[PDB]
Amino acid sequence: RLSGYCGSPWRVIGYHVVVWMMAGIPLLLFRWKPLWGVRLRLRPCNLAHAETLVIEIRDKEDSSWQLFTVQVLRYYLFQGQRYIWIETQQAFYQVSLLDHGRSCDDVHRSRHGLSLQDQMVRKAIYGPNVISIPVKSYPQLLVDEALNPYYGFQAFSIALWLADHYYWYALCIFLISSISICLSLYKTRKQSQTLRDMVKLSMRVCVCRPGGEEEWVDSSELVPGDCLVLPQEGGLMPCDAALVAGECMVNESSLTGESIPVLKTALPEGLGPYCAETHRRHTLFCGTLILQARAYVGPHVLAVVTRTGFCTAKGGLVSSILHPRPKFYKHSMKFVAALSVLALLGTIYSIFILYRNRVPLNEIVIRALDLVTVVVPPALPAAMTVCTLYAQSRLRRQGIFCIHPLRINLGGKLQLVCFDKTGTLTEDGLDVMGVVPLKGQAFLPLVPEPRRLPVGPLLRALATCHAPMDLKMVESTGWVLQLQAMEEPPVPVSVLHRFPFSSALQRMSVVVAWPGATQPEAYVKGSPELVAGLCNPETVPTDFAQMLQSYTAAGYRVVALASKPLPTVPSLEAAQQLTRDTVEGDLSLLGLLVMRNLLKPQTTPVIQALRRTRIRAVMVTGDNLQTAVTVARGCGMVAPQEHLIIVHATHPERGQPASLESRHLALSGPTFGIIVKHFPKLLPKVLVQGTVFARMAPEQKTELVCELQKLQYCVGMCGDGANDCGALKAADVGISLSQAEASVVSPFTSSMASIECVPMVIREGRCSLDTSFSVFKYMALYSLTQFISVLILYTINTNLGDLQFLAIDLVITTTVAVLMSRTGPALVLGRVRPPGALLSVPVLSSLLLQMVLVTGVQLGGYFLTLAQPWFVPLNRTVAAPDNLPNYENTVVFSLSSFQYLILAAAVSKGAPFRRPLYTNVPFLVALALLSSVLVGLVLVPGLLQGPLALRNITDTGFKLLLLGLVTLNFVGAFMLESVLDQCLPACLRRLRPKRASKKRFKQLERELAEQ
Ligand code: BEF
Ligand SMILES: [Mg+2]
Structure with a gap:
């Protein structure tokens, strides 16, 4: 929302010293209403030209903070974001001018590197690109987080109790109170310290320079607009860069969960330089592990950095965590009001009683103070x-192993839990289901079963096909092979050589030679389309397109294989001369490989037990929609008339399409981004019945969690590690089931990978x-x-x-x-x-x-x-x-x-x-x-x-x-x-409506009225 700015640095060094000295005592009432406090001291009203002290107005954004700038170019720090001072019209903006240069793309395409001509100013404005949480307030927790008023009242009562003897009671109550407050400081500080240690990256990355100059420089000096070189081995990416030439391959292990590599962008252009808002594949995310990169016709592969800082994916979670939020805390006002209205008459009543007995004026007030402090x-x-x-x-x-005394009772009345399917809804590692790599034409359904039980050349063909999936494939079959293999028992086989992967064409050819009984041959694998179109003279495609669509509709990964018999001498010549084109062009279809994404067997009983206590079970994941719906059908918790939707971001006017598979709807990332704005008229109608949230960016998870909290909900999202870091503090319950990576801080930390812990x-x-x-x-x-x-x-x-x-x-x-x-x-x-x-x-x-x-x-x-x-005790006469x-x-x-x-x-x-x-x-x-x-x-x-x-x-x-x-x-x-114990009178009077709040119930009852 909008926010206004004002300037009032200083008027003169006059009575301000006395004001600061005086205001030391009344800070308790001075803190509240900062605007009135800062307006009652000084107010040099003027235009914002060289103002250091600025105040955030309460026109629309109902909050206030304090800001302090530093002179080095005028800039300051405010929740990580940095503002840039521009003199053209004397106003403050963000760092978005140079980045949004959607004109003259030739200069962007000609970026090859700079050495010393445009570095000082860039380092001055952008500053260090590292992420660090400050530890300035090391003492200052007492003055920062102890300004509640169960401590001021406690301190006030301490003196009153010390007025009397009260030795043992005061000694015990001070010892009890000084331990929890001391442990809280350590608990708060350890979280910040471990966050600072975990969020750190200091390494030397080479930067190419024009003219043929290469040297090793640190990652601290990095600003947008420079060129970064990618080593052949590949390391880590400290900034959000973009490829400019060559072809590279990377997987979004920490961005979407699945370790599925994806092709990079292309050289042709015509649009704007980057267009990060309209480009997804072209954008190269940082913070991910690079497997292997491919060279090009140029001397080396180069990358261009266009945007870095806290606005990227790595900094987005950090910014979300350190942001303030918009029960167990609003139930004390009623109690304090009740005790005040019950004890207002008690003070005067006690004063009246004491005045009748002619009580001396020495201890008249201490009794009233004790009476006041004893009813609380x-x-x-x-x-x-x-x-x-x-x-x-x-x-x-x-x-x-969790430490959160105040968060145990917060998640007691959980209404729904947001699950995730990368490792907490599916067994880790890809397992092998019934594989049947038969021939091509004249096919028959025969017969999904555990592999290598039958006998034949298929067992050897599958054993010799290799390069965390190869180890699982070798182990999960029973027959142990890497140079020689026994326990066939007859006709033993062995491998001799293999060929590396080629990034140009997805082909894996392995040459085998067994001159004992059979003849040597070559086995190859690749995309099913390539082997189908390259085997026409041998295996004509008959009834082949009917099963591919069904296999792809379930999200399964399908890769085919092929082979071609050859005589011994050409086979050994090809194996020894390191060639690959002499075996392609005419082969025989070996079959296809099928995978399975089944869930854990123990998850179904937990899901069934969770669904019978009117607790919702929503699914949140970054995978494709087909995988999500397949997992939902496999779990089988509920699916009444499932409906599918497709984005419609093509025209200003749009309408939701109706497609077939007390109802549920599926939502995606772009679908959620398009349905919003308008938010209040389209989100409440779908956020209640929707249960699928696949194909969503991790940054949108924080926004979804924040929006769900405003609906008086109880989120129960559980993280897995290095996948959802920002959506762990604003939520109610957060459980991490893996030691890596987001398990350092979490509302709940467990060393188990099962859902049975939730109940x-x-x-x-x-x-x-x-x-x-x-x-x-x-x-x-x-x-x-x-x-x-x-x-x-x-x-x-x-x-x-x-x-x-x-x-x-x-x-x-x-x-x-x-x-x-x-x-x-x-x-x-x-x-x-x-x-x-x-x-x-x-x-x-x-x-x-x-x-x-x-x-x-x-x-x-x-x-x-x-x-x-x-006898009457001595009370009215002289006595003690x-x-x-x-x-x-x-x-x-x-x-x-x-x-x-x-x-x-x-x-x-x-x-x-x-x-x-x-x-x-x-x-x-x-x-x-x-x-x-x-x-x-x-x-x-x-x-x-x-x-x-x-x-x-x-x-x-x-x-x-x-x-x-x-x-x-x-x-x-x-x-x-x-x-x-019974509440029959409660329901005898409250009918039909009973609750004057919780509009979600009203929405549900008005939705079920017509259905
Ligand atoms: F499937 Be995930 F980790 F969101
Ligand atoms: Mg996961």
Whole structure:
């Protein structure tokens, strides 16, 4: 979208120093609204002529950053892209002027190289072509990524807690908080360091010069417009260059997955110089391995570099990764608003209570601050981390070496997973199916089967045909051959010599000679068309075009073979004289070679299990459409009235054609690029039912992932390595199943190449999310009940014992908050998903329901003691209010502890998708021990309340009533928690519509209305 620029470098060196010195404290409110902050300090409004400080306007692009330029030609760095200053009309553009030179192609064709006349300025403007992530902020993570406000509030509460004694509690909470924040810095920095090491290329590449000068220069000094020479052996390509002469052969192993070599461009011209937007074969991609290059009539092969930098395929992924994105983070505003609106009256209420008792003005405010800080606890991230560590440790047991505590629960409610077919949907390496290289005319279907089981010259012909596919062909047949071969058992054969590949014509002729029993002959292979048209006098083509179309329609690779018997003397003469034209012209059709692209047998059960839980399975790959549809039919997950489409980028007006094979559609790269613009009127109608995404460039994968995230979807794209690097961070779940190459950084990293891990990782994420939600609910309820307990304790104007409270808090943190998250998911596959977004009726129908019960059970116990002959504690007369061990405080503390115990016991729920309740034996024994010690703290008259100062009372009849009340509460809490499991009233009221959002459901229901 459009963006405006403005200039305001400086006015004068005046009050700016004082402003900078003053603004050191209020930076917390200064950071928000940068535009107002920079406009309130200085504003030298003028035209952009020599302005260093620029501000991005908020006219259409609703964001803001900071920019700093350097004077060397005015330029700066902004998300990798560099802007070029032009004085012709005083405006800023990108590096697209010289590249888009669609005029006077003669000078482009005459580019042969430069030495020293046009290098300094080019190096000054373009600069280094290397890719490096800066590590400037090595200290500065504290000031960069720690400007959230669970840390400012934590620091504010630290001083308030340090005002009192609070030794052990503060010592524990600071030690806990300083470890996670220190480990996060190392975790963040290791990713950047390994990315910097992985993205590096420093090698010496020769550059030809006019006049006959050759020397070795580094790859750092490389600018567009120069000529690069290609060595015969072939190395790596550091920049996106283009061939100008000769013929070369390369494979797009890291660009499209398949290692299928493709012919290069041609010498004839007539169009523009490069035309990268309208040319695909002519464009030579970089970052790929070169197998072999062919020379020409010239002295050597030369290449021309027309564009390099972050705009190429290598830099596109890097730019996509370091770009900011447009749950688990929007659910805190409601909670903080609720606590604020619940505690606004609490402060004034407590002030009113304190004002009645004539509280001194010394500790009047510390009590209010403690009350404010007690209804919100600084341990929620700690609880989340300690709940997550168990799942993280269990995940690593199955060979999954991933570190992402905050990403485990994100992918719990996965809706669809984007698969890829290069190594994760098909067995690595090309295997041999039933091959039957029969004769030509008078053919019969006979008979696809494992090779070399029958006997005959075909076995020897296939064995002698050779040059990662040759090794597999030799090994996967059973008969081991490279100079001599036995276990025929009869009529042994051996090879003597072979001929190299010829790039001009696809021919592979191998000469064999066995003078023992049979006669020597020659075997050749090549394209089926060549052997069909070159064998007319011997094998006339009869009914040959009917099977070729069917074989090619399935994406199978077909290569034919041929042979011609010859006498011994000419055969040996041809073998020794290194000739090839003496055997061509008249041969006999040997047959054809057929390959198979079948998927792994274990993938089908996983696909079937994934399709019965209303989870979509989309296919994303860069192969041809025929291979994609063949793989889809082979998997057989679904195919109701499959429809095929073809690009129509020929006229401004266009229409989608209708062709034959609750429906699915196939989309391609150019098809997706043409259907967009307009996006909102053509993409939503096809992005829901489409399931085929073949023949798409890797750069479009990032755009597709970004667009899918805006539709409230849950992407589950899994990478393989060196194929999809940019589409790994903006997605929800990213799993790498190979050590090379994108496995250095990923949301999930595993050492397994099977799809069976997806269901178990999904179940683990769901269980972790459920445990985290339960823990958060328990902590919120405990905070609320502590708040009301403290509020009701202000009637007598007393304070709880610091030692007992500290001990009980430590016990709760080390016993309940730890062993609670030990539950795991069962070995079953559920239908529904754990529902988050705790702002609905079924989730909010328990908070107040438990709160009213707690308030009633506290009020009854507090008001029941009025019928007992006890003396009034010293509270209104002269006494020490710091410590008052009276009966009321003791009974209130006992009731609060019992409430904590019952909440910790009855916090559990159902959801049988996880492990059953009677499984966590350590949790059960810990609860039993807690109950036993709680009973013994007040039952036995033994010496235990000495340092506790509990004021033990010789009570005889009140203990029975207390036990009856606690048993009634125990039998009531379970009933309250179990009667609300059903949601029949929820569906009795919400009909027919139930959701006020998620427009995808509305689209689905309006689409199924007419079908
Ligand atoms: F088939 Be791939 F690796 F996109
Ligand atoms: Mg792959």
